[PDB]
């Protein structure tokens, strides 16, 4: 199924409006998504919107395109370290635009928007991940509420009598936990704001894992040309939990007319989402065939399969994207540039390969031979 | 195929009586077994019954429900450390009820019952394990005898002339090794008992791996409530070879009317086999749909898929089960209890999620909030 | 070994070397407590527009930015220069730091630091000279790539080379090779950039060459433990910052509100090098003799080494009490005595009864009075 | 280092401290052989109904239960209490031990031990004070959580804290905090529970918090090497008990039948701390000088350190000969000289001919006479 | 620690022990430089038909074959004999070595070496006596399985055993057991095989028992760095030879053509034990004081220890200059000062300007003149 002749700029194909936001869904059955083995979701969470606790069968990365807020990830078996003597809960993470959040499969996750603007969050679930032992699709298990599809929360699957016995509660509260008459969807409004505990042994190790890393801050660039742009990579050498999640991310900001050097992805598929600006992408496959040659703009997604070669040139407005890759420590090999396949070949190998002269072969490898990955012609 | 709407209490569907016992087979083609990616077998070995040497394409865990005896696992390339100057063979392991045995794929394994009672042994083979590079089903390779299906031993596949040449034996003994007229099946009788050598460098490392661990002894419980019962987990932090086998086990004994707190399996499927007593199981899926709600009793098996939520309440007679999980270090997340998803959430998150008051949300998380996993209402 | 310490005491810098654009305060690594912990500690103040010259050390280190902001450069040998502009400059990536940042510098890597704000930078550095990474002696050996520094004046390593071979090696003339040797420099290791310092700043090189070396632990939003009337704790180890698994050191930022307490605890697998950044507090430390080996206040600028396994207790004064601790292990762990995750809460009541000759009621009061509470005990 | 030992000798406890419900025998960790091995050894006898008070050590240890049965508690900080009853008590899981058990206690973890049988428990403990886990001095530092012990009397760590802060920390009154400090206790570290000791006993916490800490090696059925007329050997390392890969220690139970032999061997990657639990046997040890550094009997209660690489040989007397060895490495390995897995059997006959100036026949007799035999050589 | 070295100097063997079929030269492991590096070094010459008798050492080692060819045997305990012929002999696999080979021998494994060519074998061996594998003292302890050697004469380990028990252990008579003890041997540890030495040579045992122990680094075709007018470098670490990750040592073969240079560099994570195999060259070494601690020639047969972090520079004479270095770490790494992968090339021009008080032009000349060049700088 990865033998696809065409790529398209994808957009969500089904929206579900909840009380306090919307959830956009890309088609996990598209032949490109099946090739990469992922599902992607975009949510918008209005101010005072609360994304209800749920867990998924697939590990995921969340990129915060817009807004700020608090996220909660419950690590089972870990003690509650935030407390007041009044509440007690597990630590809460405050996020802002440019952040990447890593949620392991099987962990309960909730999200609250305490900002002035909507939070826009793009999520890529690796449904092909070895951690997922169910089928190759996103299975979401809701802990509260209900989601229009429709989707009831897991507690509704228990007889209220035993739910009452398990929780130690009278059958009327046990019934309430089943959320039967709820029609708010999976993003509800906290009308008068949500107050959580917030500042302003073995639990110091596994329970204190970092789940969030900012990649949008320009000061964090790994590659920088002041007339071309910047690239910021995120993998387990920055965020340790990604060695388990087995996915990487990349923030790319190209300035006016800048280019990302032609390259292929060595060990991963790349799921790119344009957050702003405009640019042309060109993708080439193993036949030597163009499989994409088009403009990408804000809100659109394109899947570049492993080993396909790819090229980008920003428009006059610049070009900003975030890419999720289906490997930890995802790597590219550039075709030309300082660290390139061609810069590493003997000149006579280039001469006989491309039927070129010595001077032409030297131009091929040495013209860009000192530039890393962001060009400016 | 893991998208199954119903679970049933399973039982073997085909029995094969051998000279000194029977082998029961669950249907590896059942949609639940295909979802979990396992095969299970139950054997009964009468006193003086010998299970003939064989090896399988899938790693396996064996739980000894009843009886005692000796097992032999040949580790290729390891020296024979049991010897008398008369025999010489590899070390032999003496097992009893409650033991779990781990047999890697590709290793030759035999079992002898030197007790007064039958040995009853349940086996779960992980046919989806990365160690299995054949097809996703149990392929058993018999080293001696023949098994009614029918199934000849691998030596019958060799021409007796070369079998004679390889072994260095005359063609009449080489013919005998092919077990042509044998009709005893895979469990034969050692009429006058089996005598093996038995007490009463690099081979100290890999060759001395522990393959057996007892989980039935109550004194070994990891979780204990004297009015509820006990839970005993087995993974690579107890038995190192399980990091390779990639499976875990659990012994659960619930006392009269006790409950196992609602939980889901984070990183594994759970294959439970009721060894005794009686209890009700309730299982809920990602739609919020009941997919099982029934009584389980001795000799029955139920497959709880990864991430499905599940609840058990023992009957008046108590309830004992053993579970095999398709991961090393298999973990659950409880919904309520001391280490629970809900105990870890801020109260206002619960209030807005379940449309509850503060007092009700506090009852939900704090009523059982000090109890670990075994309740007694 | 010097870990049979009769008494502990709070420490302050013994010698102070003034440079052109800052000062370096050295704690005495020959003090028994530093010798027991196997560390050397230095404090630096870098005035605005001051550049700490490139140098490398035999020991891995953690730097805590007490105050200020600026630019840090860590040169990873064999990694490409990925910051570049054409039309001028190319160099490796530069790291912009701020108050509360922890920086991890492996031994043997060249490092430099520039203050581009208008307030002075104050850095506290703990070097693990007992680390197996250091195969020299158990002392801080600093190798300057440029400049000179009053230890007695330590020269840069190029000064050790003959002029002719250095010219040959660098492919330049004798005059320039002589200037690299920095013969008559009087500025020290923190020098003034009077024109400001302009640098460029906003395959396999995406892996090891892109290791994060910096993590902020001062930000309140990052707390791992928090009680609104007691304070907060933020831990730093390899589960947050991967390189620490090679550095083999951890850090902790503790901020105690008025009159609050850190539960009595001992460090399980590490020594703790505690530095007070603000406020005032009472610290008591007990050893394996049951003797009080410290019972004193700590104030801003003072340092206290708490040895592994020693039990300790802290209470903020009316002003609060803030510190940063550096611990001599990756994934340093503590064991509390009382509280929700503590040694006593894990023991059967009757073990405690017989141990302390207590009634069941007294046992349950010792065990359950704080049994719900995290390490930050509200007054 | 003290490993240039002229002679070895069998060791016995130097000092003996009597407690209310038992005694603790200390071997001398300052002996050259203990200093060469980098260990401290203690033997304890715990009378019935005696409780060893909770304490923690700077060094990881292996305990071998020579005799008796009872209950052990190991508190893992930050793990939930999973033994609980409601209607009363909650604590961490308790471990029931018996003769032949090996218990592994990481440094820095609180540990207690109760004898609930009617015969005394005899425990032999080897502490690896050279372990990298121990960042204090190379001696056994024990930190009592309760009680007092004649080292000179060592107080518990709470005695090091001031009464007022301990009351504040524990959230209790001054009277109770004073009693925790155990001022006037005369019982020592093994105390009598006259009413018996009743304890409860039949997510992530299913992983590290559920580490097995105990493994039986005395059971004959567990042998790794067995000859019905020679005896048996049972090895304990991280391939059986995972925690040992962090403890970095291994164990071995050797039981030799009348007049049998353990093949000459050397320890490849560890020192061997050998303790005789019964019987009598001849041990000969040879060093790198070809000198006999030990040639003596061993009987019940005696200890012998065999340094790494030293070659050694054992022969039981007419009574048999039983020992337990503790080795200073995970996955400790030996190299036999003769036998099926040995150095000589692996060498070409002509190498042996030229090495010993032997005929081919003599070479083959040296090489093949025992060439079929495991390490237990029948008389 | 002795790593506060005022001066370095080139070393040569202090004592020389002559055997029947060769000689062993010992460098002085008590020299400050060897004590700083934590190594012992020996050179052996093995005449044709000479056999180095089987022995094992407390320290892991790397052997470099400077000259000759022959057969090596390493006995891995508990591995099957896989070289066998029936009709006679069976033994473990034998390793045929040649000039330029590096052999890695773990501590505690029996090793022997036979010269089956007609030119003498010259082996240079570096033993890491500071390796954590060695739990004895920090000196080279060699345990002979056969023979005797003038250290004073060291006996083989079997000489330490009583004759009667050795006979019993080996299952042979008293006369043969006495001959194994090699009482009156006068040959030393390299003995003549006058009839030649004939050996056999062309499951789990396919894994650990089949570890490669030998790798050639002398072959020009194997270069990692090469400039046709400067020379070549070939690195050996665990990315080529897996066992080195346990040996924790690396090697390097440097061959400099006439007048070429190795770029100024420091060793990041290891000491360097440099031995000159041919030619002549100038080495300059600088320390953390900026002092010249070495400035001399090196010629064939001389040894130089360069401590970790010390900066060093080498220039071949008109004859070229060849060496082998052994480094005290797996995956030993260097940091160049100038060149394509260097510290200075990674730094912003303005950092260099302010550091050395240089113009932008001077800065760019220091940074870019060699900025394209690998570690081998052509004259």
Swiss-Prot record, chains A, B:
InterPro entries: 11S_seedstore_pln (IPR006044), Cupin_1 (IPR006045), RmlC-like_jellyroll (IPR014710), RmlC_Cupin_sf (IPR011051), Seed_Storage-Functional (IPR050253). Keywords: Disulfide bond, Seed storage protein, Signal, Storage protein. GO terms for cellular component: extraorganismal space. One of its GO terms (biological process) is seed maturation. It comes from the Eukaryota. Disulfide bonds join 2-35, 78-207. The keyword Disulfide bond applies. One of its GO terms (molecular function) is nutrient reservoir activity. CDD domains: cupin_11S_legumin_C (cd02243), cupin_11S_legumin_N (cd02242). Endosperm of the seeds. Residues 7-175, 213-362 form the Cupin type-1 domain. Belongs to the 11S seed storage protein (globulins) family. Seed storage protein. PANTHER family: 12S SEED STORAGE PROTEIN CRB, OS03G0336100 PROTEIN-RELATED. Hexamer; each subunit is composed of an acidic and a basic chain derived from a single precursor and linked by a disulfide bond. This is Cocosin 1. It comes from Cocos nucifera. The lineage of its organism: Eukaryota, Viridiplantae, Streptophyta, Embryophyta, Tracheophyta.
Swiss-Prot record, chains C, D, E:
GO terms for biological process: seed development; seed maturation. Residues 8-178, 215-364 form the Cupin type-1 domain. Endosperm of the seeds. Keywords: Disulfide bond, Seed storage protein, Signal, Storage protein. Pfam families: Cupin_1. GO terms for cellular component: extraorganismal space. Disulfide bonds join 3-36, 79-209. GO terms for molecular function: nutrient reservoir activity. It comes from the Eukaryota. Seed storage protein. Belongs to the 11S seed storage protein (globulins) family. Hexamer; each subunit is composed of an acidic and a basic chain derived from a single precursor and linked by a disulfide bond. This is Cocosin 1. It comes from Cocos nucifera (Coconut palm).
């Amino acid at each position: 199924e990865c033998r696809i002749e065409r790529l398209n700029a994808l957009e969500p194909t089904r929206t579900v409006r909840s009380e306090a936001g919307v959830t956009d869904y890309f088609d996990e059955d598209n032949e490109q998504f099946r090739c990469a083995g992922v599902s992607t979701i975009r949510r918008v969470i209005e101010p005072r919107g609360l994304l209800l606790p749920s867990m998924s069968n697939a590990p995921r990365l969340v990129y915060i395109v817009q807004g700020r807020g608090i996220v909660g990830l419950v690590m089972p078996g870990c003690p509650e370290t935030f407390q007041s003597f009044r509440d007690e809960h597990q630590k809460v993470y405050q996020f802002q635009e440019g952040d990447v959040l890593a949620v392991p499969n099987g962990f309960a996750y909730w999200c609250y928007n305490n900002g002035e603007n909507p939070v826009v969050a793009i999520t890529v679930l690796d449904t092909s991940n070895d951690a997922n032992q169910l089928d190759r699709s996103h299975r979401q298990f809701l802990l509260a509420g209900r989601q229009e599809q429709i989707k009831e929360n897991i507690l509704r699957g228990f007889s209220t009598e035993l739910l009452a016995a398990a929780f130690g509660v009278n059958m009327e509260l046990a019934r309430k936990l089943q959320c039967r008459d709820d029609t708010r969807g999976e993003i509800v409004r906290a009308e008068n704001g949500l107050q959580v505990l917030r500042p302003s042994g073995f639990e110091e190790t596994y329970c204190s894992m970092k789940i969030k890393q900012n990649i949008g801050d320009p000061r964090r660039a790994d590659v920088f040309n002041p007339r071309g742009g910047r690239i910021t990579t995120l993998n387990s050498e920055k965020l340790p939990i990604l060695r388990f999640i087995q996915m990487s991310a990349e923030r790319v900001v190209l300035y006016r007319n800048a280019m990302v050097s032609p390259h292929w992805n060595i060990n991963a598929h790349s799921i790119m989402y344009c957050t702003g600006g405009r640019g042309r992408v060109e993708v080439a496959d193993d036949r030597g065939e163009t499989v994409f040659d088009g403009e990408l703009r804000q809100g659109q997604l394109l899947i570049v399969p492993q080993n396909f070669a790819m090229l980008e040139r920003a428009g006059s407005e610049g070009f900003q994207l975030v890419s999720i890759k289906t490997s930890d420590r995802a790597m590219v090999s550039t075709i030309v540039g300082k660290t390139s396949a061609l810069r590493g070949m003997p000149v006579e190998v280039l001469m006989n390969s491309y039927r070129l002269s010595r001077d032409e072969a030297r131009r091929v490898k040495l013209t860009r031979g000192d530039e890393v990955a962001i060009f400016t012609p």
